Design a protein around this ligand. Structure first.
Ligand SMILES: CC(=O)O[C@H]1C[C@@]2(C)[C@@H](C[C@@H](O)[C@H]3[C@@]4(C)CC[C@@H](O)[C@@H](C)[C@@H]4CC[C@@]32C)/C1=C(\CCC=C(C)C)C(=O)O
Ligand SMILES: Nc1nc2c(ncn2[C@@H]2O[C@H](COP(=O)(O)OP(=O)(O)O)[C@@H](O)[C@H]2O)c(=O)[nH]1
Ligand SMILES: [K+]
Ligand SMILES: [K+]
Ligand SMILES: [K+]
Ligand SMILES: [Mg+2]
Ligand SMILES: [Mg+2]
Ligand SMILES: [Mg+2]
Ligand SMILES: [Mg+2]
Ligand SMILES: [Mg+2]
Ligand SMILES: [Mg+2]
Ligand SMILES: [Mg+2]
Ligand SMILES: [Mg+2]
Ligand SMILES: [Mg+2]
Ligand SMILES: [Mg+2]
Ligand SMILES: [Mg+2]
Ligand SMILES: [Mg+2]
Ligand SMILES: [Mg+2]
Ligand SMILES: [Zn+2]
Lengths: 213, 205, 647
RNA sequence: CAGAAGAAGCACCGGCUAACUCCGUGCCAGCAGCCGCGGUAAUACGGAGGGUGCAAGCGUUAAUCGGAAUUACUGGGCGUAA
RNA sequence: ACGGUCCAGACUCCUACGGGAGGCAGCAGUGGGGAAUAUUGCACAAUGGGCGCAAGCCUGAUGCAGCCAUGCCGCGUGUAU
RNA sequence: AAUUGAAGAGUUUGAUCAUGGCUCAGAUUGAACGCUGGCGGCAGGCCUAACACAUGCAAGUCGAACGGUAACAGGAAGAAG
């Protein structure tokens, strides 16, 4: 069967392919190219585990210095078929995820977006709240709603570890009778979809959520 | 250029039957004529003076199925013509072939009459006319096409016309399906419910 | 000229290979022997490889020029690889035979050693340097001696006895090399059968066209020797538009449908614009290659890429220094048209009823980014216009204004590439601007903890906040620890807002404050005098007071860099990393290469690719990822503070 | 000759001004010709349901005249409003 | 004296450097400017004009076509159940 | 027969009457812009730079004024395969 590569894995595979393609053009040394080719082949093989003939063929095409971007795109499309799209919960489930948010509404998300997104994040501009839903390591769905700063600055995004336009995202601890509460946050990409495509490691995002906690 | 929305809703807003249905069944049975259209339709607001004038103008347009631009142009002609503007305007609307075909009973509803006229099923004075706006002069003979004589709808429409009151100004012959517009309908002959004065005042505004 | 007699060639070489001079000599000697030769001169410098790439895409053949002294240079390898990518048939021409230390055999050996190309000499030089007087043709087994400096008098003589044995040996090697690609030639070679000149030429030509063999010639453009023989080789071995594989495009309506544009005058017109130039006399010149059909001057054509109708006012054929207006351009020809307003480089031109799109050239992303600041506002406007025009001419050039900093960032394929464009902007457009490395994103933080009171004083607002430094990458933490309603709950959001706003604006150089914990533990309010604004101001005042006590510092982004290089160049790289305030974390051998992992500031990684290439002779590559923010050294920090505060 | 097939959108709903509620937001984001609206129960902000007005158009902006007896000839005024 | 002459000037162009050529506020069109305004069409079949004994020739006048929701007007996008 | 013609409203006050300015409801356009867009007839379409203009075309006609024949299409005549 097709390897069920994670969306973050697929993003990583694309990046290494782009590097490999860059390497072919960039590098004027055959030996260096060979080292990169072997590395790329090994890395892709590890991600896919067992490799079918289609992956093998693609790898062969990738290994060839005559590899083309058009070929890459087709290879990416094939690899995209291997990818599994992010699951979307029932509307009833959504309300269970955010019981505190009464009549919470989720906007429509593209299936392609789900396929390329490790987590789903939608931002309500009126409330200045971004809602992020992600299935945990146990695969239990987890939803967090946090304030997003209106001001936007260019800095390395914590979620993806990639420099982009980012705004401070703060998560509020449960209030008490005293009215004491703690908000902890770090800069995150304003566009969740761009962030999802940028992210190459599910663990990094997992850590980021842990940082908010 | 034509309103294709639900016909009864127009009647509900006016609060009176606009005769936009065949009348095979009572309007009350078909819809809640009493209630105005919409969620807040049951609530009745006090009508502003502008509102009263608007509603009258809307009623007439809805009955005759005439758009504002065309209806505005009619008012100007009615004013231009000598005599009572209100009466002239109402006569001009009646002169429309669409109304004439309906009044003769060839069409069950004015919209159905429009389809017959539009689809070249009606001949006036032996020339085919596809214009609803066409004004039928006195002593003009309007007859259905022989091809369209066979159509079932027209025959049924005649029966529905028998139920309705017959205009004095229009003489119609069954089977022959020819009608002669003897005279332009008098204001007295026209329905009293329509108030011409309100329409005149609105356009004078 | 017929399609069969047309040759579209380009001249490629390393810097100072005598490439331009070679072109000059060709034009001087020339149309050649009843054949039409269209020449496109490609740049030698590594920074203008894009110009070479575009030229190679539209060319049917190419001539590699090598320096007899130098042989294959790194630039040669790069251009060779580009030509290999596009599968352009090519011949090799040794140049600067007169140059002292010229060695033909060495140059040939470097072709095999560096490029691993199946290249064999079709000619042998007699003498070297000042003693170079004649060339032996191995195909015809004849010797051509140049008696004059102009090279207009070539005497065909018998191969001298001293070089006859050499010539026979070299011919045998030539036949063997060609025979590897030709079964017919191999049979004759193995059987020791006499291979006719015509049969040998045909075999070489076929092998050259298939990009399986590379005929090597020798000469000196400066001394006007061997250029005519090279032109003969161009005619003999290099393909016509008919010989080359027809270009494949796609329909604009159906991208999936592949349409092949064969070189035919009677076919539908299809051409590709590959160069645009602004001329003082004629205005905008668009150079285009016609692949199929014909186009007449004054006709209307369709830009299939843009879906725009355009009219060609004139057709200009280049003739060395002279230029000629032509009425019609035919298939396979390369010419310039005037009046194409919307046509850019890479755009396909076709008949109005045709919708073919030829494969466009892909432009690389900028590898170097620099900040350009105009000296005056008037210069800014001129700069913007200049940048647009330059971007129109060169799509690999990217110029955009950073909205945050207001700085104009220019991106290019090389430092020289950017320097030229800056110089052009200064000279052509008279724009005075200052160019520097783009300012790196910086963040501030606190090193020490302190409890501070912010009081605003009716209008009353009093807050007591404790600021403590957070762990690196922990972000900002605000804690409301007010107990007993010392501060009304209604004003707490205002306090937070005041802090947040102040943090975003920074305390030192105006960079956002990160990795800090703020705990509101105490305050005071007045029932009548307290307002939301007062508490917001009080919070802002508290941060200012904290800035004086909490020892603020500037942070710079630290990048984790993985460098892969040969072990021979490891020493130089290690020194380079250390010189850039970088720390090597680890080193691992991978096959024949060495991999170095290091942490370097992003501020010091600007232009690292060029330095790496220089240090490793282009045998090293690197990958970098953001790791963490680290405190900037005091000396740099002061400079940053000065720059931002306008000191 | 075949077949409803191939063919509806735009602005507006606090008052002036025909057309209303719900939800989100919380002197914020916003709106606005005028009057004004928005600080946690917004028919005035944004969206949705519903409605009104127009319709191959519908709004907006600019421009001219009118309403303006507000340069008054038609057709105004001058104690205290100029 | 729009598509005549001469002179002077500013502009553009040619040149053998001596000297020369030109004027879309006719039609279409290009560049520029602007918030913004059309095709380098067809025909002299008709009307009218010039010349001619006439035939005819000439006519970007004119008759038509192209583009544009820019306006005006009419009609449709179904109609009964 | 060549007429048929004439609407106000909001806003100064705690409230009022007056005065008085401001604003809105209408009509119209060589319009422009945004959103949207089926067809036809008819009409209109550089208001800006009286800015600069590539290229073609917009003024010719008369052999019944004249010498002629540059053509060409014939004729006659004379040589000719
Ligand atoms: C004719 C040819 O082959 O290359 C010419 C053409 C050339 C490549 C020029 C150098 C350089 O401006 C080039 C760039 C990329 C410079 C940046 C932009 O302005 C481009 C729009 C421009 C296009 C080509 C151009 C104008 C040439 C060189 C290279 C000169 C070498 C050095 C070291 C400065 C040349 O002539 O030798
Ligand atoms: N000695 C010698 N010099 C040459 C020869 N051919 C060219 N040159 C010179 O070497 C330099 C090379 O520059 P250029 O011709 O522009 O070639 P490019 O630098 O490769 O583009 C110029 O000064 C040439 O005149 C040659 O055959 N012999
Ligand atoms: K008076
Ligand atoms: K005529
Ligand atoms: K008033
Ligand atoms: Mg209409
Ligand atoms: Mg050169
Ligand atoms: Mg109302
Ligand atoms: Mg509310
Ligand atoms: Mg007045
Ligand atoms: Mg007065
Ligand atoms: Mg006073
Ligand atoms: Mg006074
Ligand atoms: Mg004149
Ligand atoms: Mg003129
Ligand atoms: Mg003109
Ligand atoms: Mg413009
Ligand atoms: Mg003419
Ligand atoms: Zn991100």
């Amino acid at each position: 069967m097709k390897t069920m590569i994670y969306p973050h894995q697929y993003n990583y595979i694309r990046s290494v392919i782009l590097r490999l393609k860059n390497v072919y053009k960039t590098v004027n040394d055959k030996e260096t190219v060979k080292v990169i080719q072997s590395e790329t082949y090994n890395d892709i093989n590890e991600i896919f585990g067992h490799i079918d003939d289609d992956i093998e063929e693609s790898l062969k095409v990738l290994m060839n210095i005559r590899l083309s971007n058009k070929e890459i795109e087709a290879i990416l499309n094939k690899f995209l078929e291997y990818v599994v799209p992010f699951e979307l919960p029932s509307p009833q489930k959504l309300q269970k995820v955010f019981k505190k948010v009464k009549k919470i509404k989720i906007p429509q998300f593209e299936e392609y977006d789900l396929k390329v997104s490790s987590f789903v994040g939608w931002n309500e501009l009126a409330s200045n709240r971004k809602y992020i839903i992600y299935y945990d390591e146990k695969k239990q769905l987890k939803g967090l709603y946090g304030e997003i700063s209106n001001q936007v600055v260019k800095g390395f995004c914590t979620i993806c570890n990639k420099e982009s336009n980012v705004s401070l995202f703060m998560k509020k601890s449960k209030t008490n009778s005293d009215g004491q509460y703690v908000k902890k946050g770090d800069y995150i990409c304003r566009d969740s979809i761009h962030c999802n495509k940028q992210l190459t490691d599910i663990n990094q995002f997992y850590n980021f959520i842990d940082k908010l906690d | 250029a034509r309103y294709l929305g639900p016909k009864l809703k127009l009647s509900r807003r006016e609060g009176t039957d606009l005769f936009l249905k065949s009348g095979v069944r009572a309007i009350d049975t078909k819809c809640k004529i009493e209630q105005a259209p919409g969620q807040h339709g049951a609530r009745k607001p006090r009508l502003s003076d502008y509102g009263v004038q608007l509603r009258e103008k809307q009623k007439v347009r809805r009955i005759y199925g005439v758009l504002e631009r065309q209806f505005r142009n009619y008012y100007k002609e009615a004013a231009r013509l000598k005599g009572n503007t209100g009466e002239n305007l109402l006569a001009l609307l009646e002169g429309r072939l669409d109304n004439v075909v309906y009044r003769m009973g060839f069409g069950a509803t004015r919209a159905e009459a429009r389809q017959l006229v539009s689809h070249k099923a009606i001949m006036v004075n032996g020339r085919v006319v596809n214009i609803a706006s066409y004004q039928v002069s006195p002593n003009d003979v309007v007859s259905i096409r022989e091809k369209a004589k066979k159509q079932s709808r027209v025959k049924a429409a005649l029966e529905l016309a028998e139920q309705r009151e017959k205009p004095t100004w229009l003489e119609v012959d069954a089977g022959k399906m020819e009608g002669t517009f003897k005279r332009k309908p008098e204001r007295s002959d026209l329905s009293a419910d329509i108030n011409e004065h309100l329409i005149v005042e609105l356009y004078s505004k | 000229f017929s399609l069969e007699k047309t040759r579209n060639i380009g001249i490629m070489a390393h810097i100072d290979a005598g490439k331009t001079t070679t072109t000059e000599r060709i034009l001087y000697y020339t149309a050649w022997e009843g054949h039409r030769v269209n020449i496109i001169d490609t740049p030698g410098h590594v920074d203008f490889t894009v110009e070479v790439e575009r030229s190679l895409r539209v060319l049917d053949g190419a001539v590699t020029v090598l320096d007899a002294q130098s042989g294959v240079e790194p630039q040669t390898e790069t251009v060779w690889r580009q030509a290999t990518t596009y599968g352009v048939p090519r011949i090799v021409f040794v140049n600067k035979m007169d140059k002292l230390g010229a060695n033909f055999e060495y140059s040939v050996s470097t072709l095999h050693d560096r490029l691993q190309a199946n290249a064999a000499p079709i000619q042998l030089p007699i003498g070297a340097e000042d003693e170079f007087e004649a060339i032996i043709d191995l195909v015809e087994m004849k010797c051509f001696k140049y008696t004059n400096d102009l090279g207009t008098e070539i005497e065909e003589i018998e191969i001298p006895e001293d070089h006859l044995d050499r010539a026979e040996e070299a011919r045998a090697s030539l036949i063997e090399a060609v025979a590897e690609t030709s079964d017919e030639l191999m049979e004759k070679y193995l059987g020791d059968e006499e291979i006719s000149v015509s049969e040998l030429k045909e075999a070489i030509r076929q092998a050259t066209t298939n990009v399986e063999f590379y005929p090597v010639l020798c000469g000196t453009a400066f001394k006007n020797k061997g250029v005519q023989l090279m032109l003969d080789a161009v005619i003999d071995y290099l393909p016509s538009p008919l010989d080359v594989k027809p270009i494949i495009g796609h329909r604009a309506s159906n991208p999936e449908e592949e349409v092949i544009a064969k070189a035919d005058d009677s076919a539908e017109f299809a051409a590709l614009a590959f160069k645009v130039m602004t001329d003082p006399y004629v205005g905008k010149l668009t150079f285009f290659r016609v692949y199929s059909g014909t186009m007449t001057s004054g006709s209307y054509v369709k830009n299939s890429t843009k879906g725009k109708r355009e009219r060609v006012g004139r057709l200009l054929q280049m003739h060395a220094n002279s230029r000629q207006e032509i009425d019609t351009v035919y298939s396979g020809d390369i010419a310039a048209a005037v009046g194409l307003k919307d046509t850019g480089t890479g755009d396909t031109l076709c008949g109005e009823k045709n919708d073919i799109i030829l494969e466009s050239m892909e432009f690389p992303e900028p590898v170097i980014h620099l900040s350009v600041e105009p000296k005056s506002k008037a210069d800014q406007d001129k700069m913007t216009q200049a940048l647009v025009k330059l971007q129109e001419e060169d799509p690999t050039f990217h110029a955009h204004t950073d909205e945050e900093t207001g700085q104009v960032i220019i991106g290019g394929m090389g430092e020289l590439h950017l320097d030229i464009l800056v110089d052009r902007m200064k000279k052509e457009f008279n724009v005075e601007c200052n160019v520097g490395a783009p300012m790196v994103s910086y963040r501030e933080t606190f090193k020490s903890s302190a409890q501070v009171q912010g009081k605003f004083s009716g209008q009353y607002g009093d807050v007591h906040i404790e600021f403590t430094p957070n762990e690196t990458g922990a972000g900002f933490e605000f804690e409301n620890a007010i107990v007993g309603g010392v501060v009304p709950r209604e004003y707490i959001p205002s306090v937070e807002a005041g802090l947040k706003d102040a943090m975003e604006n920074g305390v030192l150089a105006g960079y956002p404050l990160i990795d800090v914990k703020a705990k509101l533990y105490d305050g005071s309010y007045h029932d009548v005098d307290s307002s939301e604004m007062a508490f917001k101001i009080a919070a802002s005042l508290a941060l200012k007071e904290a800035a004086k006590k909490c020892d603020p510092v500037i942070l710079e982004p630290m990048m984790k860099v993985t460098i892969e290089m040969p072990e021979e160049y490891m020493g130089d790289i290690m020194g380079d990393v250390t010189s850039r305030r970088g720390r090597v974390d680890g080193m691992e051998p991978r096959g024949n290469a060495q991999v170095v992992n290091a942490y370097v500031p992003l501020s010091e990684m600007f232009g690292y690719a060029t330095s790496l290439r220089s240090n490793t002779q282009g045998r090293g590559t690197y990958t970098m990822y953001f790791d963490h923010y680290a405190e900037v050294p005091k000396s740099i920090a002061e400079d940053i503070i000065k720059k931002n505060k306008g000191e």
